[PDB]
């Protein structure tokens, strides 16, 4: 038996914290805090305050506009029947301009809402980018997040804007809908001859698997050395303790090498940014450079051959 540090079993409150203080120029903070005994059951119970500048307001603004075009459009596709909207919601979506239009700005009823929602969404994501760089500067900190967000933004941009512009057709960006965007994904692999044989998509998959591997390992570690205040990673990084020691040693004795309280955060950091960056590269070469990845894999001798036990005659060849 032993506490697992899964659920804070006994909590404590103190007057809320408005936070470390920001320099002149960085506007006031808004909202005044509250505590959720239940968030508290598992984490900091404090909820907010939040910061909102020109940036933050222009981003929340654009973002909600974009959310409205997508939604309103979805209600329109079901005739303003909020019931039907509720019924098929998962299947509802706002499709992209048709190819007939190329990269021209299309009519409202033929895709223009998508281009506007795509436009406003992008501006709002990139404004949130700027937001995190400002919020990160007010604290003297570094832009590590911003270099990652910038990577995920990279993938996003490659998906809905960069590849489309390169391919000369807004119909190639992804449509806003749950099931619609799932279908876009499958069709994407199909159209280019099975994306499994795309090296970049294999790497992105090794890196997604790796984010789960590393965070599960590290996270389990920090809990296993939580007993020695290993969660307090900052001081174990400046002033190594037996938590960071037992931590580095568990792995050392297990897989033969190890890292440090500071470096594991770099392996993890670099592994996540890598997912999105192989991922985006992966979508970049599809249609722009390679049109049929399976064939590509055959040309580079990577696709396995199996005894042909089942086969079909080609009517196109009769």
């Amino acid at each position: 038996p032993e506490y697992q540090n899964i659920f804070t079993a006994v909590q404590v409150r103190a007057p809320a914290y408005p936070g470390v203080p920001l320099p002149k120029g960085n506007l006031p903070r808004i909202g005044r805090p509250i505590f959720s005994y239940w968030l508290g059951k598992i984490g900091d119970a404090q909820i907010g305050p939040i910061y909102l500048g020109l940036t933050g307001t222009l981003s929340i603004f654009f973002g909600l506009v974009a959310i409205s075009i997508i939604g309103f459009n979805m209600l329109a596709s079901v005739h303003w029947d909020v019931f039907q909207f509720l019924k098929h919601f998962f299947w509802l979506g706002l499709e992209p301009p048709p190819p007939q239009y190329g990269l021209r700005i299309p009519p409202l009823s033929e895709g223009g809402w998508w281009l506007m929602a795509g436009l406003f969404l992008t501006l709002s994501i990139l404004l949130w980018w700027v937001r995190t760089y400002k919020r990160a500067e007010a604290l003297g900190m570094s832009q590590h997040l911003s270099w990652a967000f910038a990577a995920a933004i990279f993938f996003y941009l490659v998906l809905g804007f960069i590849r489309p512009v390169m391919m000369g057709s807004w119909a190639k960006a992804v449509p806003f809908g749950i099931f619609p965007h799932l279908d876009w994904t499958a069709a994407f692999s199909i159209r280019y001859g099975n994306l499994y044989y795309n090296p970049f998509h294999m790497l992105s998959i090794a890196f997604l698997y790796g984010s789960a591997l590393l965070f599960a390992m590290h996270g389990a570690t920090i809990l296993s050395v939580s007993r020695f205040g290993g969660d307090r990673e900052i001081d174990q990084i400046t002033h190594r303790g037996t938590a960071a020691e037992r931590a580095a040693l568990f792995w050392r004795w297990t897989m033969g090498f190890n890292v440090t309280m500071e470096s594991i955060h770099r392996w993890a950091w670099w592994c996540a940014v890598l997912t999105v960056i192989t991922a985006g590269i992966g979508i970049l070469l599809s249609g722009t450079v390679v049109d049929n990845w399976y064939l590509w894999a055959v040309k580079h001798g990577m696709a396995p051959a199996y005894p042909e036990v089942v086969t079909a005659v080609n009517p196109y060849e009769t």
Binding site: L75, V78, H79, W80, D81, V82, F83, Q84
Partner: protein, 60 residues
């Protein structure tokens, strides 16, 4: 009026601020909802092109 006398006492049991803001929330929601409902039906007043066919007075 068919109601209680000890009916004000409810405001010693339920926070008044919440009930007030809440009513507005719920009513605004219901309002929008029903509006969209009617608009989705036979009772619609928008999708028909009357009294001057704005979509076919200079179009069609």
């Amino acid at each position: 009026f068919t109601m209680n006398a000890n009916l004000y006492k409810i405001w010693l049991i339920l926070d008044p601020r919440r009930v007030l803001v809440s009513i507005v929330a719920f009513q605004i929601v219901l309002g929008l909802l029903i509006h969209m409902i009617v608009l989705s039906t036979d009772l619609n007043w928008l999708d028909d092109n009357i009294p001057v066919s704005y979509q076919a007075l200079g179009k069609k």
